[PDB]
């Protein structure tokens, strides 16, 4: 529930910020930049999964301008494309969740690559 | 985690924004502004509980700059005070979490009050 458009914009931005931080902690392990700790990786993946379900709920009508938004007009004019990019992300996060459950480093690394590609694919089309 | 101190600031601000939104949904039910739905209340309480564990991890040394911030210097120069305020909040959130699991309206409402008091108590001294 968002009382003004500014509230939706600040909410989605906030959720993306937290997603990026926790995802990046997992990515650092996967990329061989930090030691691997499966329990910590799982905890951060679980947070990414919970958070991933939030921002894309906050792109309602009239939330396209102001408040520092970087959402492109295509988010609303190509709503089906935006939903497809969101569904691609959700599917990738499902794989990341599965990987966190198994603890399998190779499966985590694969899911990190796939998930990262879903972030970039949506940004390329929908984010300034 | 935080590469730059600005990353900590943006992180804690972001967590607080999400906490306020989801807590506000529970509060609206406690105040009788929205019909009570124990399942939905429990979902929002669960999110508040998860999120509540995040922002207070992002007030490390040197994070009074690197991005715009409303954190008062006392966060760092009255660290015991800030910790007491954080612990009061965590205790209240613990009760909120328990209340969400019972689905008892009265227990949720009481924990909403205690939790909101903890938000305000910290802000009065530190924001
Ligand atoms: C579309 C389906 C997206 C997916 C998948 C991801 N992001 Fe994104 N992001 C998207 C938009 C339209 C915006 C702009 C939001 C606005 O209104 O301004 C963003 C923004 C971000 C940000 C910036 C937050 C800020 O500066 O306040 C970050 C850090 C970010 N996104 C990260 C991110 C990551 C790591 C993702 C995958 C794990 C990801 N996003 C997915 C659209 C979409
Ligand atoms: C101290 C122990 C705090 C408790 C408990 C709560 N908050 Fe707070 N909050 C605190 C600080 C020091 C700041 C400033 C952070 C900064 O670096 O700027 C905040 C900020 C907020 C915000 C604003 C976020 C923004 O505009 O980007 C909100 C919406 C907020 N806090 C809400 C909030 C709620 C609802 C709380 C209880 C459920 C709560 N905070 C607790 C310190 C503390």
Swiss-Prot record, chain B:
Keywords: Electron transport, Heme, Iron, Metal-binding, Transport. One of its GO terms (biological process) is electron transport chain. GO terms for molecular function: electron transfer activity; heme binding; iron ion binding. Coiled coil: none annotated. The keyword Transport applies. Heme c binds at residues 12-13, 69-70, 119, 122-123. SUPFAM superfamilies: Cytochromes. GO terms for cellular component: periplasmic space. Binds 1 heme c group covalently per subunit. It holds the Pfam family Cytochrom_C_2. It comes from the Bacteria. Cytochrome c' is the most widely occurring bacterial c-type cytochrome. Cytochromes c' are high-spin proteins and the heme has no sixth ligand. Their exact function is not known. This is Cytochrome c'. It comes from Rubrivivax gelatinosus (Rhodocyclus gelatinosus).
């Amino acid at each position: 529930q968002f009382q003004k458009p500014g509230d939706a914009i600040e909410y989605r931005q906030s959720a993306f910020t937290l997603i990026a931080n926790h995802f990046g902690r997992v990515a650092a392990m996967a990329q061989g930049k930090a030691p691997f700790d499966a329990k910590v990786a799982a905890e951060n993946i679980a947070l990414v999964s919970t958070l991933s379900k939030l921002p894309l709920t906050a792109f309602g009508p009239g939330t396209d301008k102001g408040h520092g938004t970087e959402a492109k007009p295509a988010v609303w004019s190509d709503a089906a494309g935006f939903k497809a990019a969101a569904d691609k992300f959700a599917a990738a996060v499902d794989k990341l969740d599965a990987a966190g459950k198994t603890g399998d480093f190779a499966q985590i690394k694969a899911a990190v690559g796939e998930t990262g590609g879903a972030c970039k694919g949506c940004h390329d089309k929908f984010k300034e």
